[PDB]
Amino acid sequence: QDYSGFTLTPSAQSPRLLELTFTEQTTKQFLEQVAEWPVQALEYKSFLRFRVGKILDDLCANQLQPLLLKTLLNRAEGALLINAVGIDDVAQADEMVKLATAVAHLIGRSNFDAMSGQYYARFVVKNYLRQPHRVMELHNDGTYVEEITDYVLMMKIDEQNMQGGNSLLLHLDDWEHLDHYFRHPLARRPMRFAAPKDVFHPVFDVDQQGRPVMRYIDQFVQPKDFEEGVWLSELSDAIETSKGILSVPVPVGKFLLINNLFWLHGRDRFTPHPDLRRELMRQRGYFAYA
Amino acid sequence: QDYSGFTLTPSAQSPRLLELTFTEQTTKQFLEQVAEWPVQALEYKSFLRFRVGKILDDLCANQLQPLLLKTLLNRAEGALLINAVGIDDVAQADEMVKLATAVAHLIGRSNFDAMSGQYYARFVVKNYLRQPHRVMELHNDGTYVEEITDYVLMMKIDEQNMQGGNSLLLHLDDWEHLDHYFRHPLARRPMRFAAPKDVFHPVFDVDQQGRPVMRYIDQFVQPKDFEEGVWLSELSDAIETSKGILSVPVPVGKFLLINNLFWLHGRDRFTPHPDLRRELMRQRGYFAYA
Amino acid sequence: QDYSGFTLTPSAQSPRLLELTFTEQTTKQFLEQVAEWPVQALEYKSFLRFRVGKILDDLCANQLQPLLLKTLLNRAEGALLINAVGIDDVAQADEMVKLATAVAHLIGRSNFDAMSGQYYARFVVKNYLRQPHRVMELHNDGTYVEEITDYVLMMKIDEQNMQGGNSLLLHLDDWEHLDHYFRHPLARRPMRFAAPKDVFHPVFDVDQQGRPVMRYIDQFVQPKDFEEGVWLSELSDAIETSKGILSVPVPVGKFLLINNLFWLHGRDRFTPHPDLRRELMRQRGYFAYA
Amino acid sequence: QDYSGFTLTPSAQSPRLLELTFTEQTTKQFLEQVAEWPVQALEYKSFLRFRVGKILDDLCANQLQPLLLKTLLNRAEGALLINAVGIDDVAQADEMVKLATAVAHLIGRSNFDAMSGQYYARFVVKNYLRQPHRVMELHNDGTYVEEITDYVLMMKIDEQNMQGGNSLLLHLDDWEHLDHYFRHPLARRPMRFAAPKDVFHPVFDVDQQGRPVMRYIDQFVQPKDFEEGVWLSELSDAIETSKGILSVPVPVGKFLLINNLFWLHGRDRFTPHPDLRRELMRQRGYFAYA
């Protein structure tokens, strides 16, 4: 398939993860057509988040939106690494926020983020949970609020003096222990989840066709007793040692966009360096389509 | 396996349907040990329904109850035809009610039946829905009340001048159109069900492992529009013409006991005869096990 | 416009009331294709009401359903007189119920009727509210239940020795006093309505575009005081003396199908005759369309 | 004061009870102007109850309605005996229902009556609670339903071979034991009232100015214990032996209309006679005024 305005190819890590790259021409026209709205105008007026999405999609002859949706909702796939030729440097952070906003608002809506007070959040890492030699464990987002998070978007804004730190991904259908954990008696028992109002939901559920989906994070699940706590500790080990995990470099200017129901994500350890600098932007939300 | 007090063999119709026959000795001892409780005492005091179950199970060295449960809950099976050597005539109707009560109360509890005002009901057929030349369509029981019916028990009390009229059975896993109907967009949409307070639930759902189960009856489903109504009418035809349907003679003194979640049941047409007489007893309820 | 399977022409009474007549060929094929479902099967299985609708629509090359909907929802129209060549005698009552059922279930669903215990009701008139010399006052149906009745269907099944008795119709946009009553302070005040649980709603409301619609009947409105009661009594007189009222003979085998939000209906007086016989069928329900 | 269409004079029993008599001319014009509505039309269409009220009031140059309201709401009065010259015989029962309906619907609305299924009820007495030698104890109406009854209307339709049976009345401000019972600790304690859903309210309350009002009947009050029951039994005796009670003959064609908050009513004993005949009509409701 030859698409209008972008190309599409499988990643080096997995055929489940597709790489979508906007052509230089699409990128220039996009930036020109959204220059009248600074990032602040997107912050203030949520309708402009959808408008910039429409602008990008029209520049791709209305082929982008159905491709995004089909890829993210397809159980066999459900993940994209996305970039635009010519947006690849920390000095273009505003342009990166604009691009990611447009893509996200073609498939749904980005929820309010408590860490920033906006629909997206940016974080800066320089040199117990912020240990460089520790892996951030695989998890799903949104486990401690009532409404389901359908997607997670993570964009690399900057990277300096950085060895390691790849994003880690696990698709449930590549996880060799899924069948063992999904069939356990505890799998579909509602458990308490709390951040530091509590919600109750199981670790596993099923999609419309009956296939397993997952809502799990070690930090926010609150086992009520020994039985639950021992089972969860083993679950954790069975995720973290999986042979199906992907290790994905996210270069500056690219972002991962993944279906949060059947992908888990995390982050690899990295080398400490006095002049290390890593900057990320995230957006999480719900799918909505006509 | 040689069981104590009963034998067990697959039916002529399907390996999914097992035939359990209590030996003559078990039958005589059972009747002796429950003779102090007439059927009326079972009607009045629901604990005696469980007591007579315990009596039958003890006579089978406590092998009956786990066999019943495992067979009814096993997706590959989930149906029994049950009888007792020496109970085979309409004059022993009381003994038949006692036997069926004991078996049912080993796996759960029989619900109140509006047609009789008791935990079981008996009906007598002699010569538009009571047409002999019409098939009673395949359906699940309990579709129009809030709590799920897990089992259906149908016992033949009497049969005279009767050609045809077999019980019809369809296990979902023998139904060739299951995949087509379970994946349709309407399959898991809650629909209104009413008898002649309304409840809302879908036609299809899933068991704990994600496999399809069904709660359907043509008469009590109330489609809200053309879309729903046309789809249900086709569903009906796809059930009634299935090649997977079993045709099971139920002789006097035997009863079918089936898992109402993944078996549908109905009844075949029969020949009119001036001196026809058919008498049935039913019991429906929920599973409960330690 | 030449339609496939039916013709369509304005009535002698008003361009707002269109007459739709199924051709003889459509009628014969329709009756052949629904002969396997007697009226009782429609009573028992509500999905078959939609199926017979689909059968009629397919015979009209799928032109009937969009024509019905557009006519009934069009403010300038909203009423049909409908018949089928060859169905015109009391001996074909079953065929008349089948036809009217098919048409109704193409535009929505007919609600349960307390007078019959079915989705339609038939009534037989032979020789204070059943006085022949009295007009049945113009009204809307469904005024004393919570959910809105969108349509009313009234079919003449039989008529013998009958002088007068036409159906009376008033479209709000032909009512010369609408503006006076819709602007009164009482027009949009919720009032109590009860049949002989009470509901509360105003006599007037507005459609989506802001135009007046009405939910009124003299018998079931319960004014709470002198002010309300005097105003309603004048409203009544202003309806009953309107110059915009239509007088429509409904011959045997025809039925009126009207939008109950902006049409009121009633019935004219008639001559007593020892051997008078009039038989009607009604169906009332809600619109539903994809 | 000379009123238009009626005269007004204090009763022989008490200055608190005024007698209002419609003149012969007002009566004839009233009957002429309401002849198009039989009593059945009033039953069917509650707005006509208010319309006939308007007709009577207009014939009294709009002086009747404010006189009715002021008299019934005035604490010093609150009771009327009402009649119309020329309506005085059982053969004019329909005219009596029309008159009483008009008066009542000028001051409020008559509630549904369970004994008749209509807004008024008629009863016929001929020769333990229906003993002739027993007094019907003084009480307030409406004590066992949630909403307050503000007025009681009792009209004599017929009387034959009748000695005694006067209506008994007690205004709270003529009751010598009021102060003793109103100040008791139990006076304002909510008690259970039930007819043969229960409501809870005290025996005494206060009007807007802080003056005592009463909601009491011996038959429907349900004391919860010895304390309540003994106090109520003494209350009863203190009402029934009061020196303030009025004894009012109600002749055929007249009706009492009383404020049910500060008047109690009952009925005196009477002589048995083989050919006794007494016929009453009642209406009870709430006040409503602009």
Ligand SMILES: [Fe+2]
């Ligand atoms: Fe995360």
Ligand SMILES: [Fe+2]
């Ligand atoms: Fe059944």
Ligand SMILES: [Fe+2]
């Ligand atoms: Fe009507």
Ligand SMILES: [Fe+2]
């Ligand atoms: Fe009373």
